[PDB]
Amino acid sequence: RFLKVKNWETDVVLTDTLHLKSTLETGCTEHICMGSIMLPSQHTRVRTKDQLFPLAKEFLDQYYSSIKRFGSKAHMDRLEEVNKEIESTSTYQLKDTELIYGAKHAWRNASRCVGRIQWSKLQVFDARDCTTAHGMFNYICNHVKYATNKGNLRSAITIFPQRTDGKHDFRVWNSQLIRYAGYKQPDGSTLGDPANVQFTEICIQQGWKAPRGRFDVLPLLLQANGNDPELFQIPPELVLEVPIRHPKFDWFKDLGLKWYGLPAVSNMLLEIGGLEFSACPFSGWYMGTEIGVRDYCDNSRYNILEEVAKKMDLDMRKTSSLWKDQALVEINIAVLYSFQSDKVTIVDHHSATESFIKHMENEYRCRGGCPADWVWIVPPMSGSITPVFHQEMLNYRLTPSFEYQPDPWNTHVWKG
Amino acid sequence: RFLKVKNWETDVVLTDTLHLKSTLETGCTEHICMGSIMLPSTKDQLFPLAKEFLDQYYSSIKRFGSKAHMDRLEEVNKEIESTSTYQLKDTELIYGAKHAWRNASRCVGRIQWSKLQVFDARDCTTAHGMFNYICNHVKYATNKGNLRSAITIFPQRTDGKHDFRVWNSQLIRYAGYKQPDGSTLGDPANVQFTEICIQQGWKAPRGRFDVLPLLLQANGNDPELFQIPPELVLEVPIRHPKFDWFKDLGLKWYGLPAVSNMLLEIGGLEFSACPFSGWYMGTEIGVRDYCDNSRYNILEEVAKKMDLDMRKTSSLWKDQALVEINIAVLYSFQSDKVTIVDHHSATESFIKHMENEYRCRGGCPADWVWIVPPMSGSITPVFHQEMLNYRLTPSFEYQPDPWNTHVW
Ligand code: HEM
Ligand code: HEM
Ligand SMILES: Cc1cc(N)nc(CCc2cc(CC[C@@H]3CCCN3C)cc(F)c2F)c1
Ligand SMILES: Cc1cc(N)nc(CCc2cc(CC[C@@H]3CCCN3C)cc(F)c2F)c1
Ligand SMILES: C[C@H](O)[C@H](O)[C@H]1CNc2nc(N)[nH]c(=O)c2N1
Ligand SMILES: C[C@H](O)[C@H](O)[C@H]1CNc2nc(N)[nH]c(=O)c2N1
Ligand SMILES: [Zn+2]
């Protein structure tokens, strides 16, 4: 069965056959679309030898196809080797080549990621020999240095040991490797990043001396082999930050804003051939709107629209003045200007969405499809003047994949 | 099976049971979501449809299982066995139309759903008659700029050979002509229709904002051209409250958004001609009509007049111009006292409407892809609102364009 998507701006129609290789479920049915649910049951992640070899076999079939060795003696022997290692040891180990392939294809298959044109240029750091939280700190430091590269950002992922019985998990408790603390005040107001208040409290309880400023980089909280997590401060010279100024508004610097340069997601689960890598930090570079729209202007985040509009002296009485929309653009101009001025890699939403359209068309041509989540691909400002708004998209889940997992502090069994 | 939807900006969680009543299909499966696809796809079938509708109608008036209910169910059952169709009582027709709007999961304006004015045009027989009903609709809905929601319902389909159709997509739309030199004058979305108008007899001004004539088809006959009287077409010249050069652009839009090419389904009956109208949300004109590349596409021209740095996309000059254009639209309509709602006000209304529907109905089908405005998405409350999309009936459905179908 073939399926067609149409771009209603260009009338370009593409044909998807790749959705036929889809295994996992969407969450939708014939009678309800769950397309806007943030965490469906299926996108989140306890696994026995029963279902593991079919998952291994499918991944290895995919791997050896991609290297033009399907049905080779190398292919058949590896299947035999994995089979015996599973029945003997109940799991198996990926080769280095398989791990790299798997991690790149997990990114390639991330239907909510607009930055996937870059998927083949991913630096994979094998941290599967790591055993302790200190060892994890060292691997993460090296990732942060390599990926930052003095502002010339490089995509990277660091992969810690896979889950075994679910009782010895490696976890990075931070949602992102670099994030600002958030503090709830007795008067109800929040200082810093409201998104991080719960995590900041865990860190403080674990013994972190909080500076209690508005832009305090949080410490790393690292769990190795299912032991209690441990606190580590990222070396400040490794944390690249950009002061935010506006190219025309000199008062903008006086808002005291900055942001870190490296977006590095650290709380997701990487699934490859039925193996679960529960600690797999990955990083790229920012699209401007992630900082300027969501981080600064979400009502539940830094929420600076009011103060920015106040200093612009906009008509703030009625919303029909679009003072909210006016300030949002300026703030997003400032983020982009500050990053480019400091020669820190960033991409605006116009460039990033045009690239993704080209990526997607290329993927239909060479791969038969490109799974894409329109709800997430369309940027959070100026939607319809980007070409993805007009792009029909098919969403389905391929493996290897990145999945959500529950926050560790809700599942962890504390040792003491 | 009793589903939850979270708003992530407020942590409010609503429980949806209404979707269990869903009847039609969504186009998705467990293996693939088609949430962003624009248009996914006898006597026996008719009575169950009628029963389901009459069941919900007599429930809404708290007469479920009453004498009158069973009597009406009996009477419609008899009419279908006899005539192979049936006719709605006026009260049922009004209910059905209001609920088709209530059920339109892509519409952000549905908080107003119960205040719809329904014009029963089922006694209509000719295109001249259709024209009369439509002029009355336009005048009533326009109301000197104090816009009022309205629908006019022409006779239901019978055998598919006697269809009533309005060929225009909207009662009021600007013409579009291809220029010999390559580009497009007027509205590019309306180039083929502007063709069929001329190509059926229209005398075009070949201007930029020429109101298209109505192309009315009654009882499946050939469609006929009618000019809407200009004094009924309320238009707003577009100026900016800060940029005096803005007026020089020569932009205007019409005040009445009036969809005329959809199909209204009630209790299994199909109303192929059912023009309906409300009032604009500001982004419909300014973001889509003016700035879509496939439309009037004035962005580059406006940015030049603002003297913005158009060398690189990262100066966000398109975003800056886009905001100003939409400030102007709202300013112009408000100054002329023509009803319009900005996208902040309308989405806040829709959140309140969802809360109302979940509380008094058990849910509210909603299509996030269409509810979220085409600018400033994440600073409106609907962006952070999970939504369950499902198809309830009565409903508005899309239908094939008539010129592809009409046995001429
Ligand atoms: C290199 C430049 C990259 C850019 C510009 C980019 C951009 C984005 C953006 C804007 C989102 C939307 C999420 C949000 O708004 O919070 C996203 C999602 C995502 N990105 Fe990328 N990204 C990049 C690199 C990467 C890399 C290196 C990986 C993994 C190896 C990755 C994996 C993902 C995944 C898994 C999601 C989905 C998150 C979810 O399902 O909730 N991205 N990306
Ligand atoms: C009164 C103020 C109203 C407002 C502000 C409003 C707003 C909107 C908007 C912004 C859309 C998105 C579609 C697009 O972007 O082109 C839409 C769709 C729609 N509206 Fe409403 N509307 C209003 C009244 C009505 C009325 C009176 C009806 C019918 C009785 C209606 C039925 C619909 C339907 C059926 C759709 C979606 C068509 C589809 O499925 O593609 N609307 N509306
Ligand atoms: C590598 C990279 C590059 C880039 N440019 N941006 C990112 C961040 C994108 C991103 C976000 C989230 C969580 C968003 C959270 C959860 C729900 C809503 N929000 C609160 C999870 C991810 F896996 C992810 F990749 C990553
Ligand atoms: C009553 C009313 C009030 C208001 N404020 N706006 C409207 C117009 C919105 C609208 C659009 C469309 C088609 C959109 C077309 C077809 C494909 C994509 N697009 C180009 C169908 C509708 F039923 C509709 F209601 C109507
Ligand atoms: C491809 C995509 O479905 C298409 O561009 C849709 C997206 N969302 C929309 N939303 C609204 N309100 N109106 C539209 O015409 C569209 N078009
Ligand atoms: C409810 C809704 O799905 C939620 O707000 C989503 C919508 N789209 C998004 N898109 C991106 N890129 N990031 C997000 O956090 C979200 N949030
Ligand atoms: Zn779906």
Side-chain angles (χ1 to χ4, degrees), chain A residues 9 25-26 29-30 33 36 38 293 299 319-320 325-326 330 340 348-350 380 382 384 392-393 395, chain B residues 9 25-26 29-30 33 36 38 287 293 313-314 319-320 324 334 342-344 374 376 378 386-387 389:
Chain A
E9 201 190 336
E25 301 169 285
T26 60
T29 76
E30 261 92 339
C33 175
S36 66
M38 193 147 94
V293 192
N299 288 342
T319 71
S320 62
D325 315 69
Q326 259 183 316
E330 295 309 332
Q340 295 159 349
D348 60 88
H349 53 283
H350 303 289
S382 302
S384 55
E392 290 183 342
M393 291 168 196
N395 192 22
Chain B
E9 192 200 312
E25 291 156 42
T26 70
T29 87
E30 330 91 83
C33 171
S36 67
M38 175 94 68
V287 187
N293 264 263
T313 66
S314 68
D319 317 73
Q320 239 162 351
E324 299 302 322
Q334 288 167 324
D342 67 75
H343 52 287
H344 303 295
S376 302
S378 68
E386 301 179 335
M387 294 170 199
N389 192 31

Side-chain angles (χ1 to χ4, degrees), chain B residues 112-179:
Chain B
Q112 291 286 299
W113 75 265
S114 61
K115 297 188 269 280
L116 186 57
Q117 181 63 229
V118 182
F119 294 118
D120 184 354
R122 290 178 292 165
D123 65 353
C124 192
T125 68
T126 68
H128 273 90
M130 296 178 67
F131 172 73
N132 189 48
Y133 271 110
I134 287 168
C135 289
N136 289 354
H137 184 132
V138 171
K139 187 174 195 157
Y140 175 83
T142 302
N143 188 26
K144 303 177 188 270
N146 184 12
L147 305 164
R148 307 178 286 192
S149 305
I151 181 167
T152 296
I153 299 165
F154 292 106
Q156 73 210 30
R157 178 181 283 106
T158 43
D159 54 20
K161 257 48 233 188
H162 303 21
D163 273 10
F164 287 73
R165 293 289 303 264
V166 167
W167 284 37
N168 319 46
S169 47
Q170 286 178 236
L171 297 185
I172 301 172
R173 277 205 94 170
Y174 294 120
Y177 324 84
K178 278 190 170 289
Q179 299 286 56

Side-chain angles (χ1 to χ4, degrees), chain A residues 40-108:
Chain A
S41 311
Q42 289 70 21
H43 199 2
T44 321
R45 292 292 189 278
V46 52
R47 188 175 266 155
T48 64
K49 67 174 69 277
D50 202 300
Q51 56 271 78
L52 184 53
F53 185 82
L55 293 181
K57 177 181 194 304
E58 177 171 349
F59 168 73
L60 294 170
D61 291 353
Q62 293 169 208
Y63 172 63
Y64 281 85
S65 283
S66 76
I67 65 168
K68 295 290 189 68
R69 302 286 189 277
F70 188 86
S72 57
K73 187 175 180 293
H75 183 198
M76 291 307 118
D77 290 351
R78 179 60 178 153
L79 278 178
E80 255 297 283
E81 174 175 65
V82 168
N83 187 236
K84 293 162 56 176
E85 187 181 349
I86 287 165
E87 64 185 357
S88 157
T89 80
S90 230
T91 184
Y92 72 102
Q93 298 298 315
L94 295 176
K95 309 296 200 178
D96 291 24
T97 53
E98 302 167 352
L99 185 76
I100 294 159
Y101 173 91
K104 286 174 180 189
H105 276 261
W107 183 10
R108 186 184 192 177

Side-chain angles (χ1 to χ4, degrees), chain A residues 43 107 110 112-115 122 155 268 282-285 287 290 347 376 402 404:
Chain A
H43 199 2
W107 183 10
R112 289 172 168 179
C113 174
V114 73
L122 176 72
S155 320
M268 286 196 79
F282 57 79
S283 58
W285 53 81
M287 181 163 76
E290 304 177 82
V347 64
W376 279 64
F402 289 107
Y404 280 105

Side-chain angles (χ1 to χ4, degrees), chain A residues 389, chain B residues 38-39 97-98 100-110 112-113 116-117 147-151 170 257 259 262 274-284 288 339-341 346 367 370-371 373-374 391 395-398:
Chain A
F389 184 93
Chain B
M38 175 94 68
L39 328 142
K98 281 183 181 179
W101 184 10
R102 193 183 192 174
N103 292 348
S105 67
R106 290 183 162 167
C107 174
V108 64
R110 286 178 279 162
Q112 291 286 299
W113 75 265
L116 186 57
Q117 181 63 229
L147 305 164
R148 307 178 286 192
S149 305
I151 181 167
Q170 286 178 236
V259 171
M262 302 214 67
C274 56
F276 56 90
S277 63
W279 53 80
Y280 267 118
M281 178 167 77
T283 54
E284 293 181 85
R288 302 307 308 286
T339 311
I340 193 165
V341 57
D367 184 335
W370 289 59
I371 296 291
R391 293 221 51 93
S395 56
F396 296 103
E397 307 286 5
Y398 281 105

Side-chain angles (χ1 to χ4, degrees), chain A residues 22-271:
Chain A
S22 173
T23 47
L24 324 175
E25 301 169 285
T26 60
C28 304
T29 76
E30 261 92 339
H31 291 99
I32 197 150
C33 175
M34 311 237 299
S36 66
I37 309 297
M38 193 147 94
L39 317 169
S41 311
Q42 289 70 21
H43 199 2
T44 321
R45 292 292 189 278
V46 52
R47 188 175 266 155
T48 64
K49 67 174 69 277
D50 202 300
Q51 56 271 78
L52 184 53
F53 185 82
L55 293 181
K57 177 181 194 304
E58 177 171 349
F59 168 73
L60 294 170
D61 291 353
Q62 293 169 208
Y63 172 63
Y64 281 85
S65 283
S66 76
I67 65 168
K68 295 290 189 68
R69 302 286 189 277
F70 188 86
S72 57
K73 187 175 180 293
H75 183 198
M76 291 307 118
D77 290 351
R78 179 60 178 153
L79 278 178
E80 255 297 283
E81 174 175 65
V82 168
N83 187 236
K84 293 162 56 176
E85 187 181 349
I86 287 165
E87 64 185 357
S88 157
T89 80
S90 230
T91 184
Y92 72 102
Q93 298 298 315
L94 295 176
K95 309 296 200 178
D96 291 24
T97 53
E98 302 167 352
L99 185 76
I100 294 159
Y101 173 91
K104 286 174 180 189
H105 276 261
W107 183 10
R108 186 184 192 177
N109 290 340
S111 62
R112 289 172 168 179
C113 174
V114 73
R116 277 176 293 168
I117 192 159
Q118 296 286 346
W119 71 269
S120 61
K121 293 128 178 186
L122 176 72
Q123 187 53 230
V124 175
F125 292 111
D126 191 346
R128 289 177 298 174
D129 60 17
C130 183
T131 71
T132 68
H134 281 89
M136 288 174 72
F137 173 71
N138 193 50
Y139 268 114
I140 290 169
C141 280
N142 291 348
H143 178 138
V144 164
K145 203 172 175 171
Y146 175 92
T148 300
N149 187 27
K150 298 184 174 190
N152 186 15
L153 273 38
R154 294 182 285 202
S155 320
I157 179 160
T158 293
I159 305 181
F160 290 104
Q162 73 216 31
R163 182 170 298 162
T164 60
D165 61 354
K167 297 171 177 181
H168 299 68
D169 286 3
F170 287 70
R171 291 298 292 279
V172 178
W173 286 36
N174 313 51
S175 62
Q176 294 178 28
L177 291 186
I178 300 174
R179 279 216 97 170
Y180 296 115
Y183 308 87
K184 203 82 176 295
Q185 310 276 68
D187 69 2
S189 65
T190 302
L191 169 62
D193 197 334
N196 301 325
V197 171
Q198 188 188 11
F199 180 73
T200 301
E201 287 164 2
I202 291 172
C203 293
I204 288 179
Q205 174 192 343
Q206 302 309 317
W208 184 54
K209 274 302 174 311
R212 301 196 60 90
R214 192 155 88 136
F215 298 106
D216 305 336
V217 168
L218 281 161
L220 288 169
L221 192 48
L222 311 174
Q223 167 179 4
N225 209 40
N227 295 306
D228 289 351
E230 300 172 14
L231 281 172
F232 303 93
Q233 172 230 76
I234 305 169
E237 65 265 45
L238 265 41
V239 184
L240 183 48
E241 293 183 296
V242 175
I244 303 317
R245 57 278 194 186
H246 192 279
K248 280 332 287 283
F249 301 157
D250 182 57
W251 52 258
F252 202 99
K253 59 181 200 303
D254 296 322
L255 292 172
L257 303 167
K258 64 186 181 186
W259 206 251
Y260 46 95
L262 181 68
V265 170
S266 54
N267 59 0
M268 286 196 79
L269 189 152
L270 165 60
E271 199 208 297

